[PDB]
Write a protein that binds this ligand. Structure first.
Ligand SMILES: [Zn+2]
Length: 257
């Protein structure tokens, strides 16, 4: 079954999911000098004031904070998007060391980690239907670098002890994802895919230019998580990132000059 190791990692995924070699796969390298400023792009609208978090969960490939998406509470709109996208969950990708971990790269630069806030288009009714559409999902990608602590992340970090292994989950209510956003909403955008199986080509990517800083102690707690279930040989959940994929016939647009 798929993972990030030598024998089941990204280089193997195409066997079960042939779309892995498709025309709009993610992540990609963002070449900042080739990305064109698009004055027709709208500002991003990130409306998270009424977000209702539910649970935090180790799913064997990341940890995930899930939200109540049964109403328009926390929504993404504007930017390159048409219509309304509901926040379902967020998760992270990170490295074994600070010099790798992000999925997107910027001029080949790898960040220590990458946050993905996953939203689905309300015109398709549920996320299962949305992932079967070219404009079904919008994922907001935020880079993490190591420096000063991110206060808004600490409540997440402090509960990771309770979900060490695959399949563990905990109540995680009243978490405010606004505390994970950088100051600027300047972004790059391109059409792409889920970066984990099934790798469905259903995502409008919105990747913020400004990283957030997290502390070494915060990211160290990420690295104590396990891929494995309880009672199995301990394998640290680290380097759970897919590398950059061919850009092919796509253009990355910038919201900023
Ligand atoms: Zn992700």
């Amino acid at each position: 079954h798929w993972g990030y190791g030598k024998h089941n990692g990204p280089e193997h995924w195409h066997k079960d999911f042939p779309i892995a070699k498709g025309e709009r796969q993610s992540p990609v390298d963002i070449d900042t000098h080739t990305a064109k400023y698009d004055p027709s792009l709208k500002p991003l609208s990130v409306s998270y004031d009424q977000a209702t978090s539910l649970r935090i969960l180790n799913n064997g490939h990341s940890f995930q904070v899930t939200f109540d998406d049964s109403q328009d509470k926390a929504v993404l709109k504007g930017g390159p998007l048409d219509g309304t996208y509901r926040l379902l969950q967020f998760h992270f990708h990170w490295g074994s060391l600070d010099g790798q971990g992000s999925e997107h790269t910027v001029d080949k630069k790898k960040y220590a980690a990458e946050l993905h806030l996953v939203h689905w288009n309300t015109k398709y009714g549920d996320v299962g239907k949305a992932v079967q559409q070219p404009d079904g999902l919008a994922v907001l990608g935020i880079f993490l670098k190591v420096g000063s602590a991110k206060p808004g992340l600490q409540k997440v970090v402090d509960v990771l002890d309770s979900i060490k292994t695959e399949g563990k989950s905990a109540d995680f209510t009243n978490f405010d994802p606004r505390g994970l956003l950088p100051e600027s909403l300047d972004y790059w955008t391109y059409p792409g895919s889920l970066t984990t199986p099934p790798l469905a080509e259903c995502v409008t990517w919105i990747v913020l230019k400004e990283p957030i800083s997290v502390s070494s102690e915060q990211v160290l707690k990420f690295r104590k998580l396990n891929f494995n279930g309880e009672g199995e040989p301990e394998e640290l959940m680290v380097d759970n990132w897919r590398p950059a994929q061919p850009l092919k016939n796509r253009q990355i647009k910038a919201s900023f000059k």
